[PDB]
Amino acid sequence: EEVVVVAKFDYVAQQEQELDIKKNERLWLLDDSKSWWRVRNSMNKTGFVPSNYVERKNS
Amino acid sequence: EEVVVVAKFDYVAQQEQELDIKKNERLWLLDDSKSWWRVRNSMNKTGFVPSNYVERKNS
């Protein structure tokens, strides 16, 4: 459910909602069942949603 | 690449960084190649990082 993850690479956060990490840092993964996509709505609000809640429009 | 996605299901945001969405709403997916995990560091700062930059310490 919550588990510890290890950074494989550095990451410089590009927004306030992101986290800067360093290679080999250990971090809590809050929910190991959740992968998130960053989306933007018709009102120009941006945020994260669980990736399985959306799908590409091709029909 | 940016693409249009469609909500499969409603989602009520649990945190300010997430977005509320309604089934059938159309959204911009800012980067179709990018999935994120929410993590918490040793200083108890939380944020999103690309999922492929981190791996489980155990299994």
Residue numbers in the entry:
A (entry chain A), B (entry chain B): 4 to 62
Give the exact sentences the study uses for this entry.
Nck proteins are composed of three N-terminal SH3 domains and a single C-terminal SH2 domain (reviewed in Ref. 3). Nck recruitment is required for complete T cell activation, and its inhibition dampens TCR signaling by reducing Zap70 phosphorylation. The objective of the present study was to initiate development of an inhibitor of the Nck/TCR interaction, specifically by blocking binding of the first SH3 domain in Nck (Nck1-SH3.1) to the PRS in the CD3ϵ subunit of the TCR. During our studies, it became clear that Nck-SH3.1 exhibits conformational diversity and can swap half the number of its residues to form a dimer.
During the crystallization efforts that led to the monomeric apo- and peptide-bound Nck1-SH3.1 crystal structures, seven more structures were determined that all exhibited domain swaps, leading to dimers. The swaps are located at the exact same position in all structures (i.e. Lys-36 in the n-Src loop), clearly visible based on the high-resolution electron density. Dimers are formed by exchange of the C-terminal 25 residues, almost half of the entire SH3 domain. The interface thus generated contains a short anti-parallel β-sheet encompassing the CD3ϵ sequence 36KSWW39. Superposition of the Nck1-SH3.1 structure with the bound CD3ϵ peptide shows that domain swap and tight peptide binding are mutually exclusive. The C-terminal half of the SH3.1-binding sequence would get into steric conflict with the second SH3.1 domain in the dimer. All of the dimers are swapped in the same manner, but with different juxtapositions of the second SH3.1 domain with respect to the first. The hinge at Lys-36 provides quite a bit of flexibility that allows the dimer to pack in many different crystal lattices. Indeed, the hinge region varies over ∼6 Å within the superposed ensemble, and the distal loop covers a distance of ∼8 Å in the dimers. Given the large number of swapped, independent chains present in different crystal forms and grown under different conditions, swapping seems an intrinsic property of this SH3 domain.
